Every structure is written in structure tokens, then in C-alpha cells.
Amino acid sequence: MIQIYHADAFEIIKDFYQQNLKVDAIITDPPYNKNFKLLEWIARYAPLVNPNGCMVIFCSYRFISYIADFLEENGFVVKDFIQWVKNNPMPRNIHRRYVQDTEFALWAVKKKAKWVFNKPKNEKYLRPLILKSPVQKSLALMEKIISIHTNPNDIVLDPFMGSGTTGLACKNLERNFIGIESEKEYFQTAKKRLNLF
Amino acid sequence: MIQIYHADAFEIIKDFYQQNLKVDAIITDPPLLEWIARYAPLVNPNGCMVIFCSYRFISYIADFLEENGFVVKDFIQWVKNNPPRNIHRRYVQDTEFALWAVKKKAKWVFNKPKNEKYLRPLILKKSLALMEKIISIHTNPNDIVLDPFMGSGTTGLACKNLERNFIGIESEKEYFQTAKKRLNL
Amino acid sequence: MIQIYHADAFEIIKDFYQQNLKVDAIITDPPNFKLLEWIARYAPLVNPNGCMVIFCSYRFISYIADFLEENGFVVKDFIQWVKNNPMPNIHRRYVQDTEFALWAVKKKAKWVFNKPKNEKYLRPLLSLALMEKIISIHTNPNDIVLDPFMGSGTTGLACKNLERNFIGIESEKEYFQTAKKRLNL
Amino acid sequence: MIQIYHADAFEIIKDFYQQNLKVDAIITDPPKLLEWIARYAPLVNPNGCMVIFCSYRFISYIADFLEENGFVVKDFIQWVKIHRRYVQDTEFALWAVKKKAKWVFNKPKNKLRPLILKSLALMEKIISIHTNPNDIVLDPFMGSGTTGLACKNLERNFIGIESEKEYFQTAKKRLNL
């Protein structure tokens, strides 16, 4: 099942309250990254998650401490952080500074939740991909995140879905996606990648 | 030159003000925001800091630094090949962090090898080799490196092998004399 | 009609969505963070012509008012009342005698108001008497008032004396049974 | 001593840094409006305070901002003075002191609401309270004056700034010059 909306996440959320919607996991990459604003989508969307559900939020090292504390204020337990590295950076300036090859994501679960994890064998580390693509997002990255923290019929929610790619990953993994995007061009891009019409 | 102290970093620091001390780089792994503000005045105009931290803090420490006249340039990380608690419900934590910040108008060091870039100096078999690479990068041979919490040393030992002139402080008696043995009398 | 619950306002709210509850006025004094978040969740329950009256602090009220205006409410005004027996300086400081409340209405609403025989406004009082006048003003006789934090009651009691059909929630069991007895069981 | 300037508070402030100026209390009613605080805070002496007239749609922000700049927010003071809404009787002011300050306060014979009916009496009573006889009072936006005039009558050594010339010459006349 794939269902996407063209809307403002801070408005359709009220409609989700009326429908008493339940989703298994929110896997998203929020905008930006008073800090409330916007940690606030978290406080607003946190009630949708099932007792055993989790969250995965992509972010910047200048924020993650704030996001994590906020999550644990809203009824989640932060288990760990995951990362993925790009092999071809911008660079940009290599004689005065490090290249930023690395992006981060936060992983938190509901408080008394029995969470998924789900671990192919092997036994496994903190960084899903060495990836390729230079300069988002790679389908392969999202597929491995979604392969890990969700199971086949669990409901995945991406309040900012952008191009899709969270939804596309869920589809290939047969995971029942719901997603939201504000701007029409990205919405139409996600909608075409996901067929429908 | 190597000089170590057995003391509380939050008290002997005042003695440093009286001595009008200046240091080139502070490289440490503290055992939390406020020591930065008190040890920041010791830093030279072109100096930097490298502070080991946790992902639950690193965002705070970065912001606190930028309030005190430093610019957070980047973060570095290094991985252990040997951690394991329950691997079936969770990731193993292989990854450790440090924050890299420089003085505001500083002309900082960097100093890359023939090698190139990235964000991650080492994997493993804390480690002297790691500290050796941090100090090799962010300091020059005669600069003064300060470690307000030096623990075992190894910031000091790395500095000694690289001929970089260490100063350090340790509160707990066991670790200090361990550090005192590792360098020399 | 009076209905009270022993529960957490941040959970039972979903039950209010299932029941499609609609309320005319929310008049409450919450016990920072979550002080803004209940607004966004409880706001949809208010009828097109309804209002809110929120007790708050001068250290907050600018936030709450502005938050109200992003959520489909219009901040109309603030009201205040004075306490005759405050306590902490007094030799170094003002006595804190004054408490505030926020008054907001739904955006396109034709709101209640409803002033008595004489003239003018803004400082109701010198408690039941306070709430009776607030409720006498901003609601009409058969309208529905909701107090997600009712504490001792007294928001409900004012509604009962004024025949205004109260709903209220209280988390702490001691205060709830206080309100439950104060009304009846 | 009374000293007034006709200028913009957001640049002449730099001249005040050059003169190494220090003022004991800033008492003002500004016409964004948070940052003048950040620039004018260093001028305040260790035991000094600030009194800022503001709106309840702001008062919480200004307070938080004051406490970001090295002041501690003590309290607010207020004074008086459509059929469908309340009449607006109330104006606010924020009162803050420097952090480790031993501040003024200075209450009468004795005990938040100074007046029942800017009035010179209001400002005179504020200044009678939060300053002492020779302390230096600064009003970066002084408008019509009346902060300077209270300070003159109470012998408090005023400094003030106004951008618009109409109010300035009115303030200049009231202070003689």
C-alpha cells in the first residue's frame, strides 16, 4: 500500500488525528537542521507511532544532541546513531580542512517498545553504506535502513518525503508507505517514481 | 618540555591566569561545558581545540564553543575493530567522536600529508597512534599542547614522540602517576 | 452537564478525536515545552465561534500568544487579577501580586465577550469568584467549556453555578477526587 | 549634568564604545528591537539595571534576551492608563539587573503598580526607585524627553538619544537646553 499527500505537514497532521492513524515507523529527513521550531514536527507526529515503533531522523552533528534529548522528552528512547559515507566529496578545500564525506542519522524507539532491528546475520556495524553518489538520496541507503528497522507489513511514514525514495524503498521492500511533500514539483516526482495516477 | 600537574582543572586554572599562560592547542577527552569557558582564554590567536565527546553532547559543545570565540570547523571520528553487548537488538558502538574548533580569526594549522583528506584517521587492532595523528595534523613541532584532563597521558606521550611540548592536568591519583611513569620522573 | 476524567491530557486527546468532541471554550491553567504543545493538539476541538482563556506567566505569554496566532487563533487581549497575600522579597524587590491570563478567539469567529450593565474592562478583580466572572464573560449559558487541567475543579464549579456544561481532565488522583467531590459523584 | 544627542542609537553606540562610556541604568521605551539590548548592555555598570517599556506580545522575548546578555530579570511593572473586547488600560515595563549586581531598588517608607492615571510622575517615581541621586541614566530612545526631565528634577545626570528632530527639539527645550 502506498499513499502520498501533497500538503503541509503541520496541517494534514490534524486530519491524521481525526482518522486515528497509526504508523509503525517515521523515517525522514526534516528541513533546516529558538530551537522548537523545528524540533516541533517531532512532538506533533510522535503520537502516531505504534507502541513497538521506532523513528529514524537524518540530521547534522550541530543538532543531533538537541533532537535526541527532545525525542526522549516526547516518549522515545534513543538507542543509537547511524551514518553513511560518500566516496567522492565536493571536496571542497583540502589543504586547510577535512572533506565532509559523512552524513548522520538518529535511531530512537518508543519507550517500552519491542523494536525491530533485524540484523541480516552478520554481525553488524554502525555504517550501512560506503555508497557512491557524489556532489540525494540513494535508493540503496534507504532500502537498508528500511530493511533494518521495519518488517514487511509495518507502516512507514515520511512527513517530508522529498523526491520519494523513502516510499520507493518501502515499495521494493513491500512495506506500506505513507508520505507527505509540500512543494508540487517534488511531489509530482515522487508520485511518478511511485507510478500511481 | 613536558610539564604535568596533579590537581583539579577548575582551580589550578586560576593559577594559570596569574602566570599569564598561553597555549597553542587544547586536546582533551573530559570526564562539562564550563571548563571550556575558563580554559579558552589560555589559547593563542591561531590556536585550536580538539575535544573528544559523545553524540549526545557534540551539538552542545559545538554551540558553547562558538559562544566563546571559537569557530567549529569540523568533527572527527575514529573506529574500533574490537568493541560486544547485545548485537541482535542493537548496533555495536564502534565509533567515537571528537570536535575540532579553531580560534575565530585564527590562521589554523591543518597540515595534510602526501595522503588525502577524509574525516576518520584510524581503525584499530585512547590509542597512541590516533593521538599521534591528531597531533601530527592540528599542531606544528614546537607548539604547546594542553590536556586539562590527560588521564593515562597518551596525549602527552604522543607529543613527546612528535617533539611537541606537552602540559597536562589529572585529578585522580592513580592515573596521574601512571602518566608520570609513562613519560618519565 | 458535567463530565470529568482522571487521565493525561496528552493521551485522552486522541479519544476526543475518536468521539469527534467539539467544545465551545477552553479555559485552563496548565502546570517548558509541553506548555505550547497542548495548544496545537486541543485547538481543533473548538467550535468556529469559540475562544480560549489561558493562564500564563509574563515569561511565557509572548510565546503562547504568538503560538496561538499560528494555530488558527487570534489573540484578542490579556486579562489580569491581583492576589492580596503573595509571598517570596520585599526589601530588595517588588511583591508579586499579579497573575495573567491570555484571551484568544478562533480566527473567523464571531466571539462571545458579553459585558454587563456598566462600562470598560481588563481587570476582573481582590478562586471561584474570579472564574465565575471569566466564565460569565467569555461563554454563554449553554456553551461547552473544557479544562484539560482542571486541578481542584473550580473551573467546572463556576460552570456549574453558571449552568455552562463543563468538561475537565485531571492527572493527579488527589486533586481529581477533590474536584469529583466538589461537583458530585 | 544633562547630555543629549540627535542620532541613530544603532551607530552612535559605536562612538560610545570608543569613549569607553559607562552608564548606571538604561530606562527607555523603544519605538530588530531585541539587538539594541545586545549592543547597549556592555555600557551598564556591574550594579546597574535596565528598565524597558514593552508590549505583552514581546515582554517574554525581551526578558529572555536580557538574560542572554548578562542581566537577570527581576520583575515587570505596569501602569494605567469597543463594546466587544476589553479596554486597554495597561502598559508594561521589564526590570532587569546585572548578574552579580548589588542593585538599587530603593523603596519609600513602605511594598507593583506605580500609578492609577508619558506622565512625569510615573517616570519620576520609577527613577526615584531604581536609581540613586548621582547615578547615570541612559535613554537611547528618549523621544519627547521626560526621562531626562525626571532625571533633571531628581538630579540624576541624564544621557539621551533621539533620531527624529521634532521630538529632539521638544526634549531640548524642556531641558533648557
Numbering used by the authors:
A (entry chain A): 1 to 33, 58 to 159, 171 to 232
B (entry chain C): 1 to 31, 62 to 113, 115 to 156, 172 to 231
C (entry chain B): 1 to 31, 59 to 115, 117 to 153, 155, 173 to 231
D (entry chain D): 1 to 31, 61 to 110, 118 to 146, 148, 150 to 155, 172 to 231
Sentences from the paper on this structure:
M1.HpyAVI is a DNA adenine MTase that belongs to the type II R-M system. M1.HpyAVI encoded by ORF hp0050 is an N6-adenine methyltransferase belonging to the β-class MTase. It has been reported recently that this enzyme recognizes the sequence of 5′-GAGG-3′, 5′-GGAG-3′ or 5′-GAAG-3′ and methylates adenines in these sequences. The structural basis and the catalytic mechanism underlying such a distinct activity are not well understood due to the lack of an available 3D structure of this enzyme.Here, we report the crystal structure of M1.HpyAVI from H. pylori 26695, which is the first determined N6-adenine MTase structure in H. pylori.
